[PDB]
Design a protein around this ligand. Structure first.
Ligand SMILES: NC(=O)C1=CN([C@@H]2O[C@H](COP(=O)(O)OP(=O)(O)OC[C@H]3O[C@@H](n4cnc5c(N)ncnc54)[C@H](OP(=O)(O)O)[C@@H]3O)[C@@H](O)[C@H]2O)C=CC1
Ligand SMILES: NCCCCC(=O)C(=O)O
Lengths: 316, 318
């Protein structure tokens, strides 16, 4: 009996989740639920396409619903809602709002008797686990998290005269990283830890100074990080702009433990993690478990379709 | 009440656990059990040193016993023995014998109603978690594990005529790592993945070709890997070839996509000793909750490792 998966939202993440289900023979995607009218959305797999309102009607059909919407607006509304009617997975990433979010989701999920696993993914998710592990292995110390990865632009930069193409990355600041690696235990602000790099391909004839000036006028350009604009070629952007990754460093009073992740060729980590956690949620539900869970609550064996004995044999 | 800990075995690992306990104020170290004459065991703290033979009589005075014995000969007997009387933690590392170990510990633990967590540490332990995570994330692919670390030197190298000083390390074979990282999905044997690198200072009048031959053919614990010998100066052993970082990485290569999970240990963090202490806290909690039987790191949720409340861990770390 295939596990039954329902997907909410058909953005990049939702598409990734759909892709990842294809490598999980033990599951069947049964439906995609969309914030757009379903008729206007072309889903790649040959499966039911429904509106979000329609979901309340599909409780019997789906085992686990994977919420693939964005954290800033969709998830706060979506998580405590779908929790009322289904076992859910999500990638909620607003750290400051996690406790409030967990609580709202837990109140729904306890009342409805369903398992909801929040905040699955690289960070939160794997990185959160790294932070906890660093703490229990060096209990007196400081924790630092650094990421390097592509980030969404401010259609705005693309409407600036002379901009042919643009892509943006968050990168760790080298001076800050060194400081932490040396066991100095620095006090680092958000702004001190990472910088934005905006890579821009100019149209032939464009003035770099004007294009930069215009980019810096974009609303909220200077809000949380400092940003450098770099003008490069189309070929340069393609060749060197690449692998998302980061690292969590625990620095004792010098004792340093560093946990890292590198992703190459678009693995779609978080999408695939949602699918693995979906399996864990299904098993817990089956056991009469309920309410909100985070990665701190989920044993890793529940993630694999293999038997515990098999996991011991092959991977331990 | 504090979690009462006992240590069985006082090797470097046992010593590491003693030290780690000092950073965990919710725990109290009750005693150290040893096969050696207790008066001759130089324990750092003021903890009582006892014969291992008498550990059973401390059944009611210890919550969790952390077994720091060697995987090859100590643990195979000690694990199932101690899980009759105590919740237990160990770092059993003989991957091929894990199912048989697990079963024996499990049988003992189920019958006593204790919790036994086995095979805790960097590898097995964290790396095992990495291999799992790689598999679930990229179900169709290959896993490769690489480690770089110094050795216990279980030494006979130091007794080779002409060898003044030596240090040995297990290193990844770069070219094998490069094939993995390129997405070749190479079929790699144990011997293909790591080399033993032995750095040697030569005694006056030594015959290096004899010294090398003999290191290369000497019966050793790491027979599985080929050994490369590098003659260097004592000045250079010290500058370049001491206190190296231990660490490694687990690579999942699927389809072309690569996910790499790394660990770096710097300045002797004593990862495994510390991990054993954290997992002791989880064993005690599972025990307090009526659980029993053998567990692995695949069975233990992370929140249990921390003395913080679940709500605090969500607030501070998630
Ligand atoms: N990542 C992982 O999961 C890891 C697993 N391990 C495993 O843990 C095992 C133990 O490691 P380690 O402690 O370094 O091995 P040691 O050889 O240092 O210690 C093993 C045993 O030998 C005896 N011993 C050794 N040295 C002394 C000493 N100076 N004084 C008194 N007794 C001593 C101890 O018993 P007694 O006190 O009774 O004499 C101890 O139980 C290894 O076999 C390894 O496989 C290790 C590290 C990481
Ligand atoms: N093989 C990698 C794990 C090694 C753990 C260990 O034996 C050590 O760190 O000394």
């Amino acid at each position: 009996s295939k596990i039954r998966i329902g997907i909410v939202g058909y953005g990049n993440l939702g598409r990734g989740v759909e892709a990842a289900i294809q490598q999980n023979p033990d599951m069947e995607l049964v439906a995609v639920f969309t914030r757009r009218d379903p008729k206007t959305v072309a889903v790649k797999s040959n499966v039911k396409v429904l509106h979000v309102d329609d979901a309340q009607s599909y409780k019997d059909e789906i085992d686990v619903m994977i919420l693939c919407g964005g954290s800033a607006t969709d998830l706060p509304e979506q998580g405590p809602y779908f929790a009322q009617y289904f076992n859910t997975i999500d990638s909620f990433a607003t750290h400051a709002r996690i406790p409030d979010y967990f609580d709202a989701v837990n109140a729904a999920a306890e009342q409805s008797g369903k398992v909801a696993i929040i905040s699955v993914g690289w960070d939160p998710g794997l990185f959160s686990l790294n932070r906890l592990l660093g703490e229990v292995v060096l209990p007196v110390g400081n924790t630092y998290t650094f990421w390097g990865k592509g980030v969404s632009l401010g259609g705005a930069i693309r409407r600036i005269q002379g901009v042919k193409n643009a892509v943006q990355y968050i990168i760790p600041i080298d001076e800050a990283v060194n400081r932490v690696r040396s066991g100095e235990n620095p006090e680092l602000s958000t702004r001190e830890k990472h910088a934005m790099e905006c890579f821009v391909v100019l149209e032939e004839g464009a003035d770099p100074a004007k294009v930069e000036h215009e980019i810096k006028t974009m609303p909220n350009f200077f809000d949380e990080y400092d940003t450098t604009v770099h003008f490069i070629s189309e070929e340069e952007l393609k060749q060197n702009h690449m692998p998302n990754g980061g690292f969590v460093i625990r620095s004792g009073k010098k004792q340093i433990i560093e946990f890292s992740l590198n992703l190459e060729s678009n693995p779609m980590f978080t999408s695939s993690a949602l699918v693995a956690y979906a399996r864990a949620a299904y098993r817990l539900s089956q056991n009469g478990d309920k309410g909100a869970k985070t990665v701190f609550d989920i044993p890793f064996g529940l993630l694999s379709p293999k038997s515990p004995e098999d996991l011991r044999k092959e991977l331990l």
